[PDB]
Amino acid sequence: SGFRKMAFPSGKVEGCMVQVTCGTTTLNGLWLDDVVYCPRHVICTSEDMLNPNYEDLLIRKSNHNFLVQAGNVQLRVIGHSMQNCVLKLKVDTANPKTPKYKFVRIQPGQTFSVLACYNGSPSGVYQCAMRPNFTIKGSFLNGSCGSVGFNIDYDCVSFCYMHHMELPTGVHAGTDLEGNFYGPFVDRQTAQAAGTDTTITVNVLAWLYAAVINGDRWFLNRFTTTLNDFNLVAMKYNYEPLTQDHVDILGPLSAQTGIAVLDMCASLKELLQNGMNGRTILGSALLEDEFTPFDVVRQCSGVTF
Amino acid sequence: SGFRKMAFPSGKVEGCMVQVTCGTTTLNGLWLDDVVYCPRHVICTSEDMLNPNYEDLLIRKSNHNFLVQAGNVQLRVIGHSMQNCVLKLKVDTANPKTPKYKFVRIQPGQTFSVLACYNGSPSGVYQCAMRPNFTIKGSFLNGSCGSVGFNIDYDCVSFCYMHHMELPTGVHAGTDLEGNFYGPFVDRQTAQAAGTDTTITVNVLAWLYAAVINGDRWFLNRFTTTLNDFNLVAMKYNYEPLTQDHVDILGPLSAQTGIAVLDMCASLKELLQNGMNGRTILGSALLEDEFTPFDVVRQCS
Ligand SMILES: O=C(Cn1ccnc1)NC[C@@]1(C(=O)Nc2cncc3ccccc23)CCOc2ccc(Cl)cc21
Ligand SMILES: O=C(Cn1ccnc1)NC[C@@]1(C(=O)Nc2cncc3ccccc23)CCOc2ccc(Cl)cc21
């Protein structure tokens, strides 16, 4: 029993974290095989950040300008190239701790674990979700750039996020490992604002299923709803639309608990229109949307890595 | 900016997780140097869970009855001894991945990371607090026994908890790494109940300071309170008494934010009386008590 916000074990990623220094800026890099990946803004000064020409800044750099440190060992940079907003530093040594890995771009609503690092050293691991407005509500201080987001499938690490910046509201923006930003963000010191966020409906439903698996049934009701009536109500509360794909993905949880997805949707509709009325679900007074249906099945069935 | 429930990176502990089998029971063990630590109840059968005589059961066991598996390698058990409720299996190989470590017994309100494991394999990492009733609100299924709780100080792992059982309310009980249970629990299936739990007041105050550091000030008020008046109000909401030790520990956060501890105590009294009125504090509609003052300083600065 119990339901916690749980991250993947971070060991496979910790063995890849390195420190990247360029001039006065120090941030984190991901060392996989003979390449260190890091945010390209490591080459910027405070003036350069205002309006940077990264191709122009990078051409002026030499390999010896990038100081890469893996633990207490300095790695030798033998090449450098840029792929979108990520800098790739070719090093003379393949990381012996390189796990089986893939670079995957995730969709909003998908969750992943973040290994927050400072000076190439892992300091914490937390689970979060790619918000529908493409930001992540992370916990990051200055020096955390280059910290990565990942998932684990069997013994394979799928790297899905690299931290680049903090927006004025305290939310975070970053790229996939190919340097493509999530959301309409750019890596420049300029006015940028996160769009109005919405609730990840499929994830709230999955978390309501987790609550039922744990014995919390007070919110269940006798009613069902159509997918269109649920979406009409959901749109009014800034909830993401629920698609037939989401209904299908919730199939196993629906079969395990005996509560049809549209039956759970009618519970969610009442929760939105009436509130919790002083009650809680899994120790929360708010509807939690950072557990996907896969996270719920994985936690409630004990899948290992 | 931002405030998350954050666990320590689990890598140093993952390299210590092994699978321990004794008869038909399989659970997790912690392999440090040449010793595998695990709950002693791994030696129990169906007839031995109500009133086990562990000394009697262990004397009947031989080293070859304990099957220890580290990845796809079977370790050879060369000795066995019991220390309180933990079984120590001496093995013929020192764990090459043994980090710098210590065994530390924690106090209620203290937080730690849990690496939940099944069959010696890590499945997830989450953050916990030792509740004032000495239980932990974990997420554990059958087979998670032997999963450990820890903190990291620089490169040193402090092991503070080993999972032993789930109580009828779904909360969890276990021991330190010396086998001493936290709370009045025993490793028997005899009727056991967690005492009425209370809110870790010092941790709620620390989290209110984290909210102020992050720009959330709506709950602040112009009032202060005496320590005794705060405690008289706090007990009525099943909050733990706040001691002078707790006030002292909150000193650095008080200095950083400019809000005296008793001033923050009056904000907490107001929140308990009014509720949140549709507002949240750090994305939460409830007062969070699983961040210590040390966690807040570490995460924020
Ligand atoms: O690492 C540097 C260098 N640097 C040296 C001292 N100050 C900054 N700069 C990255 C920066 C950013 O936002 N990153 C940070 C990440 N996470 C949390 C943060 C908390 C506090 C302050 C910065 C944070 C600074 C602000 O301007 C921008 C704008 C765009 C981009 Cl892509 C990046 C940044
Ligand atoms: O593995 C054995 C079952 N066994 C058979 C044969 N020999 C032993 N026992 C562990 C047990 C316990 O509580 N563990 C579990 C831990 N975490 C989550 C759980 C979720 C579901 C079910 C069990 C859980 C079972 C219940 O009775 C007790 C009583 C005391 C103790 Cl210390 C241990 C246990």
Side-chain angles (χ1 to χ4, degrees):
Chain A
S1 313
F3 206 70
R4 280 279 179 190
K5 194 151 281 169
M6 197 186 280
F8 281 99
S10 58
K12 286 173 170 61
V13 178
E14 292 169 54
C16 307
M17 303 311 305
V18 299
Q19 180 192 72
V20 181
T21 298
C22 189
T24 207
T25 305
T26 284
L27 44 64
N28 311 282
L30 183 68
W31 184 21
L32 298 170
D33 308 298
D34 57 354
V35 175
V36 170
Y37 300 82
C38 76
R40 71 181 178 169
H41 69 72
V42 70
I43 71 185
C44 302
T45 334
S46 280
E47 167 57 34
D48 294 316
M49 277 305 298
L50 310 177
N51 196 75
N53 188 324
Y54 289 102
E55 174 223 322
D56 182 57
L57 290 166
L58 191 60
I59 213 76
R60 305 172 185 268
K61 294 269 167 181
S62 74
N63 292 332
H64 274 267
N65 291 140
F66 301 97
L67 312 175
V68 177
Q69 200 171 321
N72 272 109
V73 171
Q74 201 194 303
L75 295 180
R76 176 165 149 99
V77 178
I78 62 167
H80 64 265
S81 77
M82 183 173 288
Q83 181 178 10
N84 303 306
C85 306
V86 153
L87 177 65
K88 302 195 289 199
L89 302 175
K90 195 70 152 164
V91 290
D92 82 337
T93 305
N95 185 3
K97 296 183 188 169
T98 302
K100 286 188 73 212
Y101 77 90
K102 301 181 296 196
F103 288 170
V104 312
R105 182 170 177 88
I106 62 168
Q107 293 185 291
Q110 297 192 318
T111 59
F112 56 94
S113 304
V114 171
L115 183 64
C117 305
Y118 297 92
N119 303 297
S121 160
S123 60
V125 62
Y126 59 88
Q127 182 77 357
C128 72
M130 176 58 59
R131 304 303 313 171
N133 68 0
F134 293 102
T135 66
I136 78 170
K137 295 176 147 188
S139 182
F140 288 125
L141 302 175
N142 193 26
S144 61
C145 302
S147 289
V148 299
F150 65 98
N151 286 291
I152 308 181
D153 174 37
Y154 312 124
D155 62 336
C156 184
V157 180
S158 306
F159 292 101
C160 63
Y161 178 86
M162 173 165 279
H163 184 53
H164 285 65
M165 60 169 198
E166 181 171 296
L167 290 164
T169 54
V171 301
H172 303 100
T175 69
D176 54 30
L177 267 292
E178 303 200 312
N180 300 287
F181 258 95
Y182 284 101
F185 306 112
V186 299
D187 53 353
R188 150 164 53 107
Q189 172 54 58
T190 187
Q192 301 187 70
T196 59
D197 205 19
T198 56
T199 303
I200 310 154
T201 310
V202 62
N203 288 4
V204 174
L205 290 170
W207 172 85
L208 287 177
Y209 278 112
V212 174
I213 295 168
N214 272 278
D216 247 324
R217 300 177 69 89
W218 68 260
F219 51 87
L220 299 180
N221 64 36
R222 66 162 53 238
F223 307 108
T224 190
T225 178
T226 67
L227 190 50
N228 203 41
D229 285 350
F230 175 72
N231 285 329
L232 286 177
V233 172
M235 176 171 293
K236 181 167 113 168
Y237 293 83
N238 269 6
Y239 263 61
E240 278 296 301
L242 194 74
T243 67
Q244 187 52 65
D245 229 325
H246 294 151
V247 175
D248 292 349
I249 292 166
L250 291 165
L253 288 170
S254 169
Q256 183 186 352
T257 65
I259 308 282
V261 175
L262 295 172
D263 179 358
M264 192 67 85
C265 284
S267 278
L268 179 52
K269 177 218 290 174
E270 304 305 327
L271 287 183
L272 297 172
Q273 301 172 342
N274 297 267
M276 296 231 195
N277 313 326
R279 285 176 293 211
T280 60
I281 296 166
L282 290 171
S284 178
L286 290 186
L287 303 177
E288 174 67 64
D289 73 348
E290 303 206 343
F291 291 98
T292 66
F294 298 94
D295 291 345
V296 171
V297 171
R298 199 180 294 126
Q299 177 164 182
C300 302
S301 83
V303 165
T304 67
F305 310 96
Chain B
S1 314
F3 207 71
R4 278 276 180 190
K5 195 152 281 169
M6 193 184 278
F8 281 100
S10 60
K12 286 172 172 61
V13 179
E14 292 169 53
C16 298
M17 302 314 303
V18 299
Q19 180 192 72
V20 182
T21 298
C22 189
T24 206
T25 306
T26 283
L27 44 66
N28 311 282
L30 184 67
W31 183 22
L32 299 169
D33 307 301
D34 57 356
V35 176
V36 170
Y37 300 82
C38 75
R40 71 181 177 168
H41 69 72
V42 70
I43 71 185
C44 304
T45 72
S46 48
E47 278 84 11
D48 308 315
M49 212 56 241
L50 259 200
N51 283 289
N53 189 323
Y54 290 100
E55 281 83 358
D56 184 58
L57 290 166
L58 191 61
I59 210 77
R60 305 174 185 268
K61 293 270 168 180
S62 74
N63 295 327
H64 55 268
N65 290 141
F66 301 98
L67 313 176
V68 177
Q69 200 173 323
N72 273 109
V73 172
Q74 201 195 303
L75 295 179
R76 174 163 94 101
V77 178
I78 62 168
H80 64 265
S81 77
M82 181 171 61
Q83 180 177 9
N84 303 304
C85 306
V86 298
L87 181 70
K88 302 195 288 199
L89 302 175
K90 195 69 153 165
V91 289
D92 220 21
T93 306
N95 185 3
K97 296 184 192 157
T98 302
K100 285 184 180 196
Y101 76 90
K102 27 182 68 169
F103 289 170
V104 176
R105 181 171 178 86
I106 62 171
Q107 295 303 308
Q110 179 64 260
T111 58
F112 56 94
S113 305
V114 171
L115 182 64
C117 304
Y118 298 93
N119 303 294
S121 288
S123 58
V125 61
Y126 61 86
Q127 195 68 3
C128 272
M130 176 58 57
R131 304 304 313 171
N133 68 359
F134 293 101
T135 67
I136 77 161
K137 294 178 148 185
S139 179
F140 288 126
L141 302 174
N142 195 25
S144 60
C145 300
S147 288
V148 299
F150 65 99
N151 287 291
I152 308 182
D153 171 36
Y154 186 43
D155 63 337
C156 184
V157 180
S158 42
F159 292 99
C160 60
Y161 178 85
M162 172 165 278
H163 185 52
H164 280 65
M165 59 169 198
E166 181 171 297
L167 289 164
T169 55
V171 300
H172 303 102
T175 69
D176 53 30
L177 267 291
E178 303 200 313
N180 290 120
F181 259 95
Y182 284 103
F185 307 111
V186 296
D187 52 353
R188 291 159 60 196
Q189 270 229 265
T190 192
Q192 296 185 76
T196 58
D197 205 21
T198 54
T199 303
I200 309 154
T201 310
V202 64
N203 286 5
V204 175
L205 289 170
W207 173 86
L208 287 177
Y209 278 113
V212 175
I213 295 167
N214 273 101
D216 249 325
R217 299 178 55 91
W218 69 258
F219 50 89
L220 297 179
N221 68 28
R222 69 183 187 90
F223 302 108
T224 189
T225 178
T226 68
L227 189 49
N228 202 43
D229 285 350
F230 174 73
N231 285 329
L232 288 176
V233 173
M235 327 289 200
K236 300 169 185 181
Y237 294 92
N238 269 5
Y239 264 61
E240 275 296 298
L242 193 74
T243 66
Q244 189 52 230
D245 262 25
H246 295 151
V247 175
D248 291 349
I249 292 166
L250 291 164
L253 287 170
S254 169
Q256 184 185 353
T257 66
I259 307 170
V261 176
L262 293 173
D263 180 0
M264 192 66 84
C265 285
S267 281
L268 178 52
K269 281 159 68 173
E270 187 160 86
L271 284 169
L272 294 172
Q273 157 196 277
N274 299 345
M276 298 230 196
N277 191 20
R279 286 175 292 211
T280 61
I281 295 168
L282 290 173
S284 178
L286 288 187
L287 305 181
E288 178 64 64
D289 74 347
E290 302 208 341
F291 291 99
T292 66
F294 187 99
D295 290 345
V296 171
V297 171
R298 190 175 183 271
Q299 180 166 178
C300 300
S301 48

